[PDB]
Structure 1
Amino acid sequence: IEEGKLVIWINGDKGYNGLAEVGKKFEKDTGIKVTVEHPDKLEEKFPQVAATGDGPDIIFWAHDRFGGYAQSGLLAEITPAAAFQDKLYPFTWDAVRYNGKLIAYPIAVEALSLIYNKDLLPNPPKTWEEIPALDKELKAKGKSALMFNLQEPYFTWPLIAADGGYAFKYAAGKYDIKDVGVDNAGAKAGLTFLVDLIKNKHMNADTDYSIAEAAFNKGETAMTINGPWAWSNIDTSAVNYGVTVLPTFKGQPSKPFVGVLSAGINAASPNKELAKEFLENYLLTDEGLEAVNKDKPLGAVALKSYEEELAKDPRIAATMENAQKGEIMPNIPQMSAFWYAVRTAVINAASGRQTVDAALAAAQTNAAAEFMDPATFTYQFKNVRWAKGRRETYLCYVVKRSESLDFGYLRNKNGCHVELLFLRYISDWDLDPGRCYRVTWFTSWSPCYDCARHVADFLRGNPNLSLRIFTARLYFCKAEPEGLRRLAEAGVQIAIMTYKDYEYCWNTFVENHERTFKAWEGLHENSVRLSRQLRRILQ
């Protein structure tokens, strides 16, 4: 990493040459030259390169991604003048706020919008309730009213959320993972409305992005719900269209997910102050943002002054309108669990393979935080002698891919050893045999021969899956060691919980009320002791 010299990383699809011209104006007036680069998979590269105290001085990406960057401590905290804060829209500053502090500068704004055909529809509907009524009109001319990407949440969510559905309630500079508004009466209202639209075949419920794009661009469908990314195509489709506010369900506006292109400063950078000078006084100006926008469109922007001028275009104005009506994309990691838990729910509510409340309750509880009790964890996970006394096995689980997540814990119910429960839990959970998943366990006791047997069978039956098990203690009552040898030859990686593992569990699956991990006496000794026994068993 250089000094007296800025290096900036922006994605290839966003207009870099304009930013480089801005960087040239900076160099001209300053003498500090800046290099604008657009490398490949930079959202991946940067997290690696930054950890070594390297990489660019500034990083441009969607604000959602910057959460994991902030958690890894790769982004410097910024404290810009309350007078400068005002230059931009207040809601854009909440997108760059992680754990009650600012890690980035807001730049641009993306959000969904209602795209309608000006010929077929001179006057688009202001409500979702008009859509069936208007659908049956155009149905008579061999046309459809509305078609969009029904298969995926990002697109379907705005209708769901309009009556007060939400992902995680934003407390104040913070989301709590414990609370989720997925199964709320309003989400049920919006979702049921969607289900009614697909029941009457106002739209097929098989629809995807490509089908809806083909439909609208060839003049078949009057309205589609989509983003600036898709504007250029429709421009070259020769279709006369307009972009406007999403329709209002139950009188309340629909809530897309606002994305926010943001510039963030690498915490490893010595040039932090240089970066701030450049971003504030050069980039975030009418002049700088205009020069950037010329190279490639930014859509709506955070800077009020330039955003009034860009608002002279009603499309961009509509984007911004829907953004302010919408809700900031949460940057927290449990969002991984949100998507995957919603994605599959709406589909099952769409086909009708389950009911609305069933799908939404399933999704509600799947993407939501249940954290243990501290004393329960402390009592159940102790690896000592005389711990043969404790009765019911506990199991903390993480479902990985690393890509996506789901966390939780299970205990012995009526019958049903926890391993069998877990198998039942994940089995209900569909899976793509094309894709690969990585499951990690943390258990009180080991598995039992039966539990062992079944799990090994399950692993053989699902060769896409890979399992690793961290266990505090080994259970018996000849039998169980073999059972563990099956699991061995089955390709399961079995290990005993070391201190680092206890720390991990303590900071992951347990509600500690922000208390550190206190090692109880004889932890390491028993750990290596059980390790000797385990290594003796497996070999």
Structure 2
Amino acid sequence: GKIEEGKLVIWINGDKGYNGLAEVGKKFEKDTGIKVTVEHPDKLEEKFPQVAATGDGPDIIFWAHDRFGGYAQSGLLAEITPDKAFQDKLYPFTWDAVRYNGKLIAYPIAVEALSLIYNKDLLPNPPKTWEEIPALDKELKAKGKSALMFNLQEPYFTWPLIAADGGYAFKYENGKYDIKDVGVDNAGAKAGLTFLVDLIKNKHMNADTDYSIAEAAFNKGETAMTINGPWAWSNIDTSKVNYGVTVLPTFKGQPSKPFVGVLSAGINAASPNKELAKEFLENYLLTDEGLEAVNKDKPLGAVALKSYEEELAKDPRIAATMENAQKGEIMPNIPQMSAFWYAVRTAVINAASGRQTVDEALKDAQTGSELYRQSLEIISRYLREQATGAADTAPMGASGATSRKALETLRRVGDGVQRNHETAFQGMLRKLDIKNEDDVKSLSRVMIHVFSDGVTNWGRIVTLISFGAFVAKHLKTINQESCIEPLAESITDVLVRTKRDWLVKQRGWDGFVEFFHV
């Protein structure tokens, strides 16, 4: 389906101030005659890239900025071009969170960081360390309470602990990300997750605790502490708990490091209402009165709009939010963040339930988080050396032995496939009629149709990549060598998205090397 002209459909998460956002929508309707529909579907961050890919979905999508680079890389977002006068009304660091490949891909709304929320009637002074929580829980259990309950199903809430002693997602040094350097299974990450698993094993927490269970327990006065963001404060106000919002506890003397999000509004590339969306976001929502309406429903945190943020800055809950934000780090918006989050969510859940050990769980998470970059490194090098006749001299980098050995295996087995299946390869090449970067882009659909319509095994993966090499050779001979790298990226995208779970179960490219050994 096509997006309907002359209305606005907005998607925002169900924990945010969506009735507040609908009031801003009604003000827009009152001026313009244009109906604004606000929806909060489950798993909207997973649904958006599926429906938007077919030219469907909402006109405007709200999420934290971490998902938006993936969306932008897939052509799902309109470039945002506010004038200088509008850009200067928001803090520059919030604009930086919505910049992807030099282009603004969303409007920033507000800065979110988790804090420790504590019941002052149970815990007059909250604990400064994670390490004192077991003893504190023992004290509280004797009075029929617990120390701490928070969502263990979403790794956002457990990440601050994992990150504290040296866990990291993608390493940041000299003002740039080393996407090859992933810190999911180092000693720091292990120490943090082991502490969490030990809290569970000693019955200080329950592995099944989710968002709803922890909220209800805190807001009924059953647990002394929770971990949550500004959005949660509204329901706590209603409960009349005497609560404080403060700095997260330290682990091994070091601050808990929450991943900081910037709630952001992106415009769908398929929307025929882009001018209405920009008008709504700039002149209705991102105003003192627009942000107030949302903030009164569920608090936004530290708003991007300089004028309204000065008014809210005096709130000690916001001061505490920004203290934790400064100790933490701004999330990347790189396309791999979705894979990172999927990998760590599974690792926390399996470690918490005892399905896997901490070592086993973080091992798998590391492989999952590394999979795109390692797969690209191998696939791009094979395609490029096959096309040119000469290999890449560049160092292989992180997990370089695996990448080197996988490439050597792929040269052996892939050249065998190209030789033996030369007839079919030639026939399919002629059938596809590839001649430019436009035709290369259209291969993704046929590639995913043929590669996924069949069993999952290493032999079929070799075919995917070897035919890729066969096409790369053709692109070089027709003076279309600049298409080879986008082809490699497209093959890699198809492989890692469709076979993510299977690939991780095989120990990634080490499984490939082992399967075809001797």
TM tier, smaller: 0.5 to 0.7
**Contact 2:118-2:224 within 8 A present in 1 as well:** yes
Deviations 1:40-87 (A, max 9, x none): 986677656655666665433333443342122121223445665453
CA distance in 2, matches of 1:509, 1:126: 47
| Aligned with 2:385 (options 407, 412, 425) | 412
Change (3 A) 1:179 1:132: same
Give the distance between the partners of 1:240 and 1:341, measured in 2 at CA: 37
* C-alpha distance in 1 between matches for 2:129 and 2:233: 23
Query: Which stretch shows the higher mean deviation, 52-61 or 21-30?
Result: 21-30
Conservation of the 8 A alpha-carbon contact between 1:459 and 1:490: no
Report the alpha carbon displacement of residue 358 of structure 1 after superposing the two structures with TM. 4.5
Aligned with 1:495: secondary structure? helix
* Mapping 1:97-108, distance limit 5 Å: 97-108=99-110
Q: Secondary structure at the match of 1:197?
A: helix
Show the counterpart of 2:52: 50
Change in CA separation of 1:30 and 1:412 when aligned onto 2, cut-off 3 Å? closer
Which shows bigger deviation, 319-328 or 23-32?
23-32
Q: Percent identity?
A: 91
* Contact 1:472 1:497 (C-alpha < 8 Å) held by counterparts: no
Describe the SS at the equivalent of 1:315: helix
Q: Write 1 or 2 for the structure with the bigger share of helix.
A: 2
Runs of 5+ unmatched residues, structure 2: 373-377, 387-470, 503-508
- Counterpart Cα distance in 2 of 1:74 and 1:306: 30
What is the TM-score with the length of structure 1 in the denominator?
0.57
Alpha-carbon spacing, 1:410–1:289, altered in 2? closer, same or farther (3 Å): same
1:165-210 CA-partner distances (Å, limit 9, x unpaired)? 2222357997554321112232233223334444544435564445
User: Residues 72-83 of structure 1: matches in 2 within 5 Å?
Assistant: 72-80=74-82
Contact 2:61/2:266 (8 A) holds in 1: yes
Give the 3 Å change call, closer, same or farther, for CA 197–84 of structure 1 in structure 2.
same
Query: Which structure carries more relative contact order (alpha carbon 8 Å, separation 6+)?
Result: 2
Question: What do the CA deviations read for 1:302-360 (whole angstroms, capped 9, x no partner)?
Answer: 22321232233333443343334333444445344434433343455446676544543
CA shift digits 1:205-248 (9 cap, x unpaired)? 56444554454344332112234454444444443222222112
Aligned length: 415
**Who is 1:481 aligned against?**
none
1:73-110 deviation per Cα after TM superposition (whole angstroms, max 9, x unaligned): 12122344566545334443343233443200111343
**Which secondary structure does the structure 1 equivalent of 2:10 belong to?**
strand
Deviates more, 1:34-43 or 1:68-77: 34-43
Give the counterpart of 2:478 among 468, 472, 484. Answer: 472
Quick check: 2:231–2:299 contact (8 Å CA) kept in 1?
no
Note closer, same or farther for the CA distance 1:523–1:98 as it changes in structure 2 (3 Å cut): farther
Residue-by-residue CA offset, 1:402-461 (whole Å, 9 max, x unaligned): xxxxxxx99999xxxxxxxxxxxxxxxxxxxxxxxxxxxxxxxxxxxxxxxxx999999x
Cα contact 1:488–1:494 (8 A) shared by 2: no
**Any conservation in 2 of the 1:472–1:496 contact (CA below 8 Å)?**
no
**TM-align CA RMSD:** 9.1
Distance change in 2, residues 1:232/1:459 (3 Å):
farther
Structure 1 Cα separation of the partners of residues 336 and 260 of structure 2: 18
Question: Is the contact made by 1:499 and 1:523 (CA closer than 8 Å) also made in structure 2?
Answer: no
Q: Is the 8 A contact 1:79 1:102 kept in 2?
A: yes
CA separation of 1:507 and 1:329: change in aligned 2, threshold 3 A: farther
Bigger CA drift: 11-20 or 340-349? 11-20
Secondary structure of the structure 2 residue equivalent to 1:8: strand
C-alpha change, 1:474 and 1:206, in structure 2 (3 Å) is farther
Cα pair 2:347 2:365 within 8 Å, conserved: yes
Q: Distance in 2 between matches of 1:498 and 1:354?
A: 24
Deviates more, 1:351-360 or 1:275-284: 351-360
Q: 1:325 to 1:474 in 2, by over 3 A?
A: closer
Q: Deviations over 1:12-53 (max 9, x none)?
A: 765556556656666777899977677898667765665566
**TM-score using structure 2 length:** 0.59
Bigger CA radius of gyration: 1
